[PDB]
Amino acid sequence: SVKIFSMLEKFGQFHWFYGISIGQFLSCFKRVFIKTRVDEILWLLYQEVYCQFSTALDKKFKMIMAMTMFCLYKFDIESEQYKEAVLTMIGVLSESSDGVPKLTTNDDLRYLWDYVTTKSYIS
Numbered sequence: 001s002v003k004i005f006s007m008l009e010k011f012g013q014f015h016w017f018y019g020i021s022i023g024q025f026l027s028c029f030k031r032v033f034i035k036t037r038v039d040e041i042l043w044l045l046y047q048e049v050y051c052q053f054s055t056a057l058d059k060k061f062k063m064i065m066a067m068t069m070f071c072l073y074k075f076d077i078e079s080e081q082y083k084e085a086v087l088t089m090i091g092v093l094s095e096s097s098d099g100v101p102k103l104t105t106n107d108d109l110r111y112l113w114d115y116v117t118t119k120s121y122i123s
Helices: 002-014 022-034 038-053 059-077 080-093 107-117
Strands: none
Touching (some): 002 059, 022 038, 059 080, 080 107
């Protein structure tokens, strides 16, 4: 929760309209409970905070926030080689880290590689 709030306050200090309210965050977290267990609360928290605070951002920051929440959750859940693969994927998307990833189970990674080899950046 505090990491998500730090990301949201970074967004708020970027642009004036993109601010975040602490009371809004508590209301969203309460409505999570209104609408392996602890991981299920964490999953519902991520899904609901995105579903509420995505509409306050434009499309480009929508992709920003979506991909960075997916990255944060997957760093928390998966292993170190997975994290290295994700960082290498973001680097080759950033034209900075152009190299082989720790490709292995992680089925969606081959689909991401299929998307990126054809230079389908938007996909």
